[PDB]
């Protein structure tokens, strides 16, 4: 059907520089394009209408451009209020379709995670379930590897991750890994390791524990 392809999907910029996003439709859409911004729990706000025209209360650092099939939004000076997700909308022909989104994230120096592993709690073991939790706190960039190992073998079923967005105090990311088992399954094996790979070190970061202390 008509396809909109946005690029890049995400970037790392530092306040004060020029970013440039892109949409490209599968057929000429003769400048029927809106560019909007979506922010953490807000109302999508239109910045540019009909490919290059501004919108009521919008700064002039934003600037639409392109024609035919390729359209490109510009920000000459990334302000801190400009952080969020940019989409593009084609409204030439039905059905209306949108791009995938482009997430602008603050850039910073590399930072390895601080990993912590946590045996289940006794109160939980009394119910039947056993959750092993790994915390991977304050790292940058976002790209990270977390593997779970039960007595030296990798386990995949029952793993479940949750990430946080950039920390606006240090610009890092945080990770919560939880492997949930029965108390029955849990008690059949002894060593539990949570192993993280990340750009900062060639070797993985390991945190483990033995189920009976040793």
């Amino acid at each position: 059907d008509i396809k909109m392809t946005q690029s890049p999907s995400s970037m790392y910029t530092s306040l004060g520089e020029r970013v440039t996003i892109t949409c490209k439709a599968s057929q000429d859409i003769n400048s029927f394009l809106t560019w909007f911004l979506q922010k953490p729990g807000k109302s999508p706000k239109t910045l540019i209408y009909r490919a290059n025209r501004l919108m009521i209360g919008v700064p002039s650092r934003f600037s639409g451009s392109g024609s035919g099939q390729t359209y490109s939004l510009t920000i000459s000076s990334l302000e801190y209020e400009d952080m969020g997700i940019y989409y593009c909308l084609q409204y030439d022909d039905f059905p209306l379709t949108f791009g995938a989104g482009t997430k602008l994230d603050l850039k910073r120096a590399d930072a390895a995670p601080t990993v912590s592993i946590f045996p289940p709690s006794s109160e939980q073991l009394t119910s039947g379930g056993a959750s092993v939790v790994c915390f991977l706190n304050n790292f940058y960039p976002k790209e990270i590897n977390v593997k779970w190992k039960i007595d030296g073998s990798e386990r995949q079923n029952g793993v479940l991750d949750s990430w946080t967005e950039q920390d606006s105090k240090d610009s890092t990311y945080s990770m919560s890994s939880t492997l949930t088992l029965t108390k029955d399954e849990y008690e059949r094996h002894n060593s539990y390791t949570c192993e993280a790979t990340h750009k900062t070190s060639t070797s993985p970061i390991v945190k483990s524990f033995n189920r009976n202390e040793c």
């Binding site: 109302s43 239109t46 009521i56 209306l96 601080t114 939980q124 915390f135 949750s162």
Partner: protein, 213 residues
């Protein structure tokens, strides 16, 4: 004025129906068409259909023909959206747009689950030697319904070293973890508590993080 004001969040059981509304203010509701857009983490934005307050001409996206139903009322200055025979699949943030101005979105959650108070578990490190210059403690809030939960450490005094995580979903019950990082001279001498509130089921629980014996 720009305004478009949407109906409130809805928690609905599977197989039922909801009727969302989108109030227009500050322009002549008759001269522009209203479009309804769907937002899912999994699928990005999707167009459902649009209505003309003026001509009363509706266009539907083939996917949503039969699910969605647009209608309008000229005196109230409102456009409606009856979603029908709901299923998990329809859970999302629904918006109303004119192309230039968007409403705020209305969240729909379709689920069979009844109210379920969480189970708070404390997460202390392992018994032996694991104490460098800082210690990280934890807290696990599992099995609640529905969504909002308040999680605080020592009710506010601890904020620097806190990390709460977006609640996942696990069998239609929510699961949430939170971590805290303090100095070696802080725990376990002074006490660290995990304050958890779940208005719906009226739970307010402090759970101390005791050292493993």
């Amino acid at each position: 004025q720009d305004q478009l004001q949407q109906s409130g969040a809805e928690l609905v059981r599977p197989g039922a129906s909801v009727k969302l509304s989108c109030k227009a203010l500050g322009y002549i509701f008759t001269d522009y068409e209203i479009h309804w857009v769907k937002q899912t983490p999994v699928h990005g934005l999707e167009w459902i259909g649009g209505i003309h307050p003026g001509s009363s001409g509706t266009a539907y996206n083939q996917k949503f023909k039969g699910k969605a139903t647009l209608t309008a009322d000229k005196s109230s200055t409102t456009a409606f959206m009856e979603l029908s025979s709901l299923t998990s699949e329809d859970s999302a943030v629904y918006y109303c747009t004119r192309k230039d101005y968007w409403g705020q979105g209305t969240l729909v959650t379709v689920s069979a689950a009844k109210t379920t108070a969480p189970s708070v578990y404390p997460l202390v490190p392992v018994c032996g030697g694991t104490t460098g210059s800082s210690v990280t403690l934890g807290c696990l809030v599992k099995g609640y319904f529905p969504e909002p939960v308040t999680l605080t450490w020592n009710s506010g005094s601890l904020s620097s070293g806190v990390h709460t995580f977006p609640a996942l979903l696990q069998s239609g019950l929510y699961t949430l973890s939170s971590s805290v990082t303090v100095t070696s001279n802080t725990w376990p001498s002074q006490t660290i508590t995990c304050n958890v509130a779940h208005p719906a089921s009226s739970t307010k629980v402090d759970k101390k993080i005791e050292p493993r014996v």
